[PDB]
Amino acid sequence: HGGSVWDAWFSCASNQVAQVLLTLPYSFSQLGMLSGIVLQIFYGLLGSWTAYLISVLYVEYRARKEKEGKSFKNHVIQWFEVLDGLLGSYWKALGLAFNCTFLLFGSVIQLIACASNIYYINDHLDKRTWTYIFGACCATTVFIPSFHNYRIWSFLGLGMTTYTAWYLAIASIIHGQAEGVKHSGPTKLVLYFTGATNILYTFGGHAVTVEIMHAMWKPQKFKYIYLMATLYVFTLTIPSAAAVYWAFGDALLDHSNAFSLMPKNAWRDAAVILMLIHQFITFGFACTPLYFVWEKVIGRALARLPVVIPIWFLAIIFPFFGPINSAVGALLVSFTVYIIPSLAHMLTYRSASARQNAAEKPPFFMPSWTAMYVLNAFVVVWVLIVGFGFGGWASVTNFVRQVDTFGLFAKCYQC
Numbered sequence: 331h332g333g334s335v336w337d338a339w340f341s342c343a344s345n346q347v348a349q350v351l352l353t354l355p356y357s358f359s360q361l362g363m364l365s366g367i368v369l370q371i372f373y374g375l376l377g378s379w380t381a382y383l384i385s386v387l388y389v390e391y392r393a394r395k396e397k398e399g400k401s402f403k404n405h406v407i408q409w410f411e412v413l414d415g416l417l418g419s420y421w422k423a424l425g426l427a428f429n430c431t432f433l434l435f436g437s438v439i440q441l442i443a444c445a446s447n448i449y450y451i452n453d454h455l456d457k458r459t460w461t462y463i464f465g466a467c468c469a470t471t472v473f474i475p476s477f478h479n480y481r482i483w484s485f486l487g488l489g490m491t492t493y494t495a496w497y498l499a500i501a502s503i504i505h506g507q508a509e510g511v512k513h514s515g516p517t518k519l520v521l522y523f524t525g526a527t528n529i530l531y532t533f534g535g536h537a538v539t540v541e542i543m544h545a546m547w548k549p550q551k552f553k554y555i556y557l558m559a560t561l562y563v564f565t566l567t568i569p570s571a572a573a574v575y576w577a578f579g580d581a582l583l584d585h586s587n588a589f590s591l592m593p594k595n596a597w598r599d600a601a602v603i604l605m606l607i608h609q610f611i612t613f614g615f616a617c618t619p620l621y622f623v624w625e626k627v628i629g630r631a632l633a634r635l636p637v638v639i640p641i642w643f644l645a646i647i648f649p650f651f652g653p654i655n656s657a658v659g660a661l662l663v664s665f666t667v668y669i670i671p672s673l674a675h676m677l678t679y680r681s682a683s684a685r686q687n688a689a690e691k692p693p694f695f696m697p698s699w700t701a702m703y704v705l706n707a708f709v710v711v712w713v714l715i716v717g718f719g720f721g722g723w724a725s726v727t728n729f730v731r732q733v734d735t736f737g738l739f740a741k742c743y744q745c
């Protein structure tokens with residue numbers, strides 16, 4: 331029987347980094363080594379803190395509900411229901427819109443990544459119609475009611491992502507310096523900020539953390555799981571991305587995907603196959619809550635047939651891999667992952683009486699709530715400035731430049 335603490339850690343490790351492990355070298359080449367590492371560590375700490383914040387919010391909500399006299403024997407609670415139960419009505423609507431649109435764009439991003447990854451295996455025709463082909467495969471997931479057995483998928487994802495990251499790191503050991511390798515790190519404004527926003531995408535929770543833990547016999551212990559997961563990711567990602575960037579110099583500015591330039595061999599082929607499988611599985615994971623909300627609002631494929639088609643069409647109309655990541659980071663992720671949780675926490679715990687009856691006290695090494703106040707202020711201000719205030723100022727400019735250079739419904743991109 332799955333759903334245990336170990337299974338929760340496996341699922342967190344599998345989900346926290348699914349497809350951004352291939353774009354990160356592009357962001358690093360866009361940013362640099364030292365700055366990239368610093369930003370990754372800072373955003374990892376912030377993501378872990380926000381995960382703890384969401385966990386404590388859920389724990390408090392559950393405590394209040396159990397005080398009221400509500401039972402959840404056959405019920406599962408999502409993030410928006412908690413937002414409704416804490417803040418109000420318009421706030422519930424905002425949270426739903428944000429997380430739902432974020433999940434839709436995440437499905438689109440996953441489809442784009444899957445298509446781009448398969449593009450490097452065996453291609454003899456135009457890429458757009460290949461995405462058309464993958465559309466039917468993506469839509470076929472409607473038949474399965476749900477991925478109840480998340481344990482096997484989490485195990486496979488963890489193992490295969492570990493192997494892929496380790497191989498990406500290892501190959502560069504003898505791959506050697508690129509012919510006439512050149513490193514320049516940051517160059518100017520738009521590119522630097524675009525990379526600094528695309529990094530934000532892969533170091534949060536991706537608005538799935540709420541259900542990641544349910545069924546756990548000890549729900550209150552999410553800090554351990556997340557911290558281990560975030561760290562595990564660090565070990566997987568920092569060496570791999572750093573090694574790839576060092577090996578290939580400034581060749582990642584135009585070839586965002588790593589597999590584009592690596593030599594063709596059996597190990598690489600296995601890596602791309604594993605990445606495609608993981609991309610499909612995580613696409614299903616991301617789409618499941620959207621399907622659930624859609625069914626619950628509207629009232630065995632016809633129920634969710636009219637929701638996939640927009641996803642497929644939006645993936646088709648845009649073939650961009652990294653720019654889309656930057657845009658979603660500067661527009662959607664930067665709101666439904668960091669700003670909303672902090673704002674909700676502060677709004678709910680503004681008064682002192684609620685603090686007195688807190689479900690969970692913060693651990694020893696933060697001996698005051700004033701530190702929490704100041705940390706929330708710092709995170710919200712910083713994410714507003716560089717996430718929404720200026721991250722978009724670069725991401726949207728990059729998208730406009732893209733469309734200028736390629737237009738709409740581009741058949742092939744980065745080729």
Ligand SMILES: O=C(O)Cc1c[nH]c2ccccc12
Pocket residue numbers: 345346347348349350432433435436437439440536538612615616
């Ligand atoms: O695929 C990604 O870019 C990141 C990611 C991991 N799990 C997700 C669930 C929904 C949307 C995006 C993601």
